[PDB]
C-alpha cells in the first residue's frame, strides 16, 4: 500500500495468551534481521556477520514483549474476549538450488497464512521424521497480520529418498503433507 | 481459545533518507485498531477497537512518537542498514536444464533487481518465455526460474542471459543437444 | 553502531 525504496520492520512484537508465547523480530525489505531469544535473553542475527557490526541490546525485545503483555490484556477485555480465529496455512516445497545427486542442497518449506503463530513444521524422510539438519525462521509478518514461516532441511539427494513437509496447525482438520521427489 | 496482540513499527525510506515515513500499528487478532502515521502526524483509530485509545496516545505519546522518525528510522537506516543490508551483494548462480521446456535456474542472488533473458542462436526469445515470480528463500537470497518452450534440434544453441548489480559483466550459459 | 527498537506504548486500559 505504501510505496518506498526500502522498508524496515523495527520493534515487531507478537504476544499470545494463554501460554505466554512471545516473539520479537526485526526485518529489512522482507528478510529477518534478527530475533531475540526471550528465554536466553540474547539477540540472534540471521546473518551473524550483521551482528558483528550492529548491536541490538535484547532489552528492547524484552521490553516490547512486556508492554505487549499489558496491551493484550487491555484489548482482550475491551473486545469482550473475542478469540483469534485459526486460519488454514498453505505450504510449498522447493529446493534452494537445482538438485544434483550427491551435491548438498536445502529443501525449503514455505508455509504462509499462519495465524495464530503456533505451528509444527516437520520433515519426513521416507515417511519417517527427520530431526537433525532442520532449521526454521521466526514467524515473519504479513500485511494482513497473519504470519509465514520457512523451514529448511539440509540433505544429500539420493535415488532412494523421498521427502515430505508436514504442517500441523489448529486451523487444519488433519495435518497437511507436501511431497517432493527428485 | 487464544488471543493475540501485535505491535508493528515500520519505517519507509525513499531516495536514501530524503523521505521517511514512520508507521506504528497496534493489532488485536489481525485487527489493526490504532495507528500512528507520520504523514497524518498523529495517532488515529483504525477500527472500532481503537476509539477509546486514540486520544490517549495523542495526549501522552504524540511528541515522543513523532521524534522517532529521526530518532529511530533515520538512525537505524543511516547507521546500521547502509553497512549491512544495503551493502549486501550476492552473485547469482545460473544453470540450464531441459524438462520440451528449458528451465534457466538463477539462484542465490541478492538484492532482488535482476534481468534474465533467453537467446536462441543469438536472437532474443520473448514469445515462448515464461518466468516464475521472484522466490524469496528467507536466507537473504532470491531465486527465479525462467522457462523457454522450444523444440531441441541438432545444432541450436540456447543461451541464458543474466544481469545483476553484483556482476560487472553479464553471465552467459549455453545449452545444446 | 546500534539499531534502536520502536517502543510499544502502554494502552490506558
Amino acid at each position: 500500500d505504501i510505496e518506498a525504496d526500502h522498508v524496515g520492520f523495527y520493534g515487531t512484537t507478537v504476544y499470545q495468551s494463554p501460554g505466554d508465547i512471545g516473539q520479537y523480530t526485526h526485518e529489512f525489505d522482507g528478510d529477518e534481521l534478527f530475533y531475540v531469544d526471550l528465554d536466553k535473553k540474547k539477540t540472534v542475527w540471521r546473518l551473524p556477520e550483521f551482528g558483528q557490526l550492529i548491536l541490538f541490546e535484547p532489552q528492547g525485545g524484552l521490553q516490547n514483549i512486556a508492554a505487549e503483555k499489558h496491551n493484550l490484556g487491555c484489548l482482550t477485555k475491551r473486545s469482550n474476549f473475542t478469540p483469534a480465529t485459526n486460519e488454514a496455512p498453505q505450504a510449498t516445497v522447493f529446493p534452494k538450488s537445482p538438485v544434483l545427486l550427491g551435491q548438498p542442497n536445502t529443501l525449503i518449506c514455505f508455509v504462509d497464512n499462519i495465524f495464530p503463530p503456533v505451528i509444527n513444521i516437520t520433515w519426513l524422510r521416507n515417511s519417517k521424521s527427520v530431526t537433525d539438519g532442520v532449521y526454521e525462521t521466526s514467524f515473519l509478518v504479513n500485511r494482513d497480520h497473519s504470519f509465514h514461516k520457512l523451514s529448511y532441511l539440509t540433505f544429500i539427494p539420493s535415488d532412494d529418498d523421498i521427502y515430505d513437509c508436514k504442517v500441523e496447525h489448529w486451523g487444519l482438520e488433519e495435518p497437511v503433507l507436501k511431497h517432493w521427489e527428485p | 481459545r487464544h488471543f493475540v496482540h501485535q505491535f508493528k513499527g515500520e519505517c519507509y525510506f525513499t531516495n536514501g533518507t530524503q523521505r521517511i515515513r514512520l508507521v506504528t500499528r497496534y493489532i488485536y487478532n489481525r485487527e489493526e485498531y490504532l495507528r500512528f502515521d507520520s504523514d497524518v502526524g498523529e495517532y488515529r483509530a483504525v477500527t472500532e477497537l481503537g476509539r477509546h485509545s486514540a486520544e490517549y496516545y495523542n495526549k501522552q505519546y504524540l511528541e515522543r512518537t513523532r521524534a522517532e522518525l529521526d530518532t529511530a528510522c533515520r538512525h537505524n537506516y543511516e547507521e546500521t542498514e547502509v553497512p549491512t543490508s544495503l551493502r549486501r551483494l550476492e552473485q547469482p548462480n545460473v544453470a540450464i536444464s531441459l524438462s520440451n521446456t528449458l528451465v534457466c535456474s538463477v539462484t542465490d542472488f541478492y538484492p532482488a533487481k535482476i534481468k534474465v533473458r533467453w537467446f536462441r542462436n543469438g536472437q532474443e526469445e520473448t514469445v515462448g518465455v515464461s518466468s516464475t515470480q521472484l522466490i524469496r528463500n528467507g536466507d537473504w537470497t532470491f531465486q527465479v526460474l525462467v522457462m523457454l518452450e522450444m523444440t531441441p534440434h541438432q545444432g541450436e544453441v540456447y543461451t541464458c542471459h543474466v544481469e545483476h548489480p553484483s556482476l560487472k559483466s553479464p553471465i552467459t550459459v549455453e545449452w545444446r543437444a | 553502531l546500534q539499531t534502536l527498537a520502536l517502543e510499544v506504548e502502554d494502552d490506558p486500559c
Partner: T-cell receptor
Amino acid sequence: MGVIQTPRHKVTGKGQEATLWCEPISGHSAVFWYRQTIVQGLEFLTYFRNQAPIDDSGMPKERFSAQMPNQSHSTLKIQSTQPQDSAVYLCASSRQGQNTLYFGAGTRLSVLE
Amino acid sequence: QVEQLPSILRVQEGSSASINCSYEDSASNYFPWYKQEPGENPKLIIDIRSNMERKQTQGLIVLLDKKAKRFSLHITDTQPGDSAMYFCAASVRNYKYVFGAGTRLKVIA
C-alpha cells in the same frame, strides 16, 4: 501522585539482610531502581516493565537482587549487608517511553561496622 | 557514561548559571534534566531530544550538540528557589537512563 518508598531510613549492622520496598504510581508499568551517593550521584541499578526484569546492568554482581511480586510493589533485597552498601536507594516509576520519571523519596540505608 | 561539570556552582542572584554534560554513547537521543531539593525527590524540569538543538521554556535553556556529544542547561536570572542539586541524563532507549554525578547549585543571596 507520588512514588512511596519504605522505609525512609534503615540502619543495620554487617551481615544482616535488608529489603527495600517501592510502590510505583498506580498505572505506571516502568519501574527504576537507582543508587544515590554524594560522589557518583544517581547510578542506574535495574529496570522493570510490567513486572518483567529487563535491564539489571547496574546491579552489583553479588548480594543484590530486585523483584516485582505484584504490579504495585517492587522490592530491592540486599543480602549480608556491608558498609559500602550505604547509600540512598531511589525508586522511579514512569508511564511513557523516554519521558518523565517520577522519583520516590528514597531509602537512606546505612550499614555500620 | 555521562560527565557533568561543574560539581559545585556558586552564583549570585540575578546572574546566569550553566551546567555542561557530555556523553560517550553516540546513540543517545533523550536528554532530561532533574532538580532535587534536599531531602525531596528529583523532579524533571526540562528535556530535549536528538532531533532538536535548542529549547527555551521560562528562563530555562537546553542546548544539544549531537556531533560534539554535549548538552547543557542554562538558568537565566537565577533565583534562591533554584538552589538545589541538578542531574543531567542521557537515554538511548526507555530501559536505561545514564545520569551524571550531579551539580550542587548554590544561588547566593
